Amino acid sequence: SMSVENANEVMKYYDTSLKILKDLVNENEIKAVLGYLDQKMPVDSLPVVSQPVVSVQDTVFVSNPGNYFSENDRQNLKENYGRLFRSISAFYENYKTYRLYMQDQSYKKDNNALADKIRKEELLLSIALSEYKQVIFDILTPIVEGAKITLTP
């Protein structure tokens, strides 16, 4: 009864996680942004690539896992989502900065120092985005199986 209601909340959290992680971490878009950071890309060819904006209430829900999860699972989910939201922001904001700095010829003033700083950081962020997404699914799928046990009469 108290476990049945907790199990229903785990299913809601998993379903929201599935939807939000599909739209937030767009692997092919991430790869396309890395290609746009290439040294041989014509500066005037750099396109605008907007950050995906998912449901804000879904973001709040997954960012604050309830006490139905163990304190350890709750902390690991909260940490990985927090890092994932900050990393998403950095990845798309760094590309916006990069595009404006290349197109207004600011790169000539610092001999591409900011271009190389951004390229290195974007590569690290791209790996980390896929890592946080997989870590969240890996925490949840055994708990989800546990919730299915509680919900199968």
Q: Minimal CA–CA distance to 36: which of 108, 133, 103?
A: 103
Q: Confirm if 58 and 12 have CB atoms less than 8 A apart.
A: no
Give the start-to-end residue ranges of the domains of the chain.
1-153
Any idea of the CA torsion for 38, 132, 84, 79, to the nearest 10 degrees? -150
Q: Confirm if 28 and 52 have CB atoms less than 8 A apart.
A: no
Q: Please identify which residue in the block is written with the tokens 């919900």.
A: 151
In sign, the C-alpha dihedral spanning 12, 13, 14, 16 is positive
Assigned superfamily of 1-153: Uncharacterised protein PF12889, N-terminal DUF3829 (1.20.120.930)
